[PDB]
Design a binder for this molecule. Structure first.
Ligand SMILES: [Zn+2]
Length: 255
């Protein structure tokens, strides 16, 4: 599985049949259809005590891993029940500024999409969490091209070091609060993982407000490689999945 013509998202159903299930992600957010739910509590992002460990190139994206052995970086409130611990964050981008986000807003596509993954502490670990309908909570943030993102430069500067698949690099003292938009207004719906095994155990929380990144910021993302070191070079671009059928599900808004 990958994002090429032969192993791309239209092919995943053969090894991962849930690809055509009832609560697949991402989806298109119809803002005129989304229902304003007054019983939605504000989001609670506690990341002041976050501890990053490393960054790695897994062949489909790069991940910034966090120590989730304690309630250091948590998400609670909103539509969630209980505490969700930050395990890792990764992005999805395109070959051009015209595409890259997974979620779409009235069919509008952004340059990239940031996903913060959290698991419900009730289930003890991530592996058990992914077996429950309320197991994960993903915080999604849209990226648009404009001004540089002061807070994103640290990540940007380390990509040279993890250019190929399998590579990883120590990555401590990274503060995720630097990637957050000003407003925490959101849309939420029940969905799945965006990559196989595409388990249908996520509570998506898509922030209304995008963060802006500079052209040169995004450009460094485009220099990554899908391939392992010593194999033909295949640039890591368009590592995003096409929007899926809502199928009855309803999208709620906190505004
Ligand atoms: Zn993702």
């Amino acid at each position: 599985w990958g994002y090429g013509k032969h192993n791309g998202p239209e092919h995943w159903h053969k090894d991962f049949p849930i690809a055509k299930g009832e609560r697949q992600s991402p989806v298109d957010i119809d803002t005129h259809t989304a229902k304003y739910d007054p019983s939605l509590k504000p989001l609670s992002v506690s990341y002041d005590q976050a501890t990053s460990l490393r960054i790695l190139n897994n062949g489909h994206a790069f991940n910034v891993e966090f120590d989730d052995s304690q309630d250091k970086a948590v998400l609670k409130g909103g539509p969630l029940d209980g505490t969700y611990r930050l395990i890792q964050f990764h992005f999805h981008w395109g070959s051009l500024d015209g595409q890259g986000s997974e979620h779409t807003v009235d069919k509008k596509k952004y340059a990239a999409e940031l996903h913060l993954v959290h698991w419900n502490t009730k289930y003890g670990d991530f592996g058990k969490a992914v077996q429950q309908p309320d197991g994960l909570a993903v915080l999604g943030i849209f990226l648009k091209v404009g001004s540089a993102k002061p807070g994103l430069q640290k990540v940007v500067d380390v990509l040279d070091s993890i250019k190929t698949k399998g590579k990883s690099a120590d990555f401590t003292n990274f503060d995720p609060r630097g990637l957050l938009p000003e407003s925490l207004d959101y849309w939420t719906y029940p969905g799945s993982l965006d990559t196989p095994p595409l388990l249908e155990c996520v509570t998506w929380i898509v922030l209304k407000e995008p963060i802006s990144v500079s052209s040169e910021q995004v450009l460094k993302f485009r220099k990554l490689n899908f391939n392992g070191e010593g194999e033909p070079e295949e640039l890591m671009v368009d590592n995003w999945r096409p929007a899926q059928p809502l199928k009855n599900r309803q999208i709620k808004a906190s505004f």
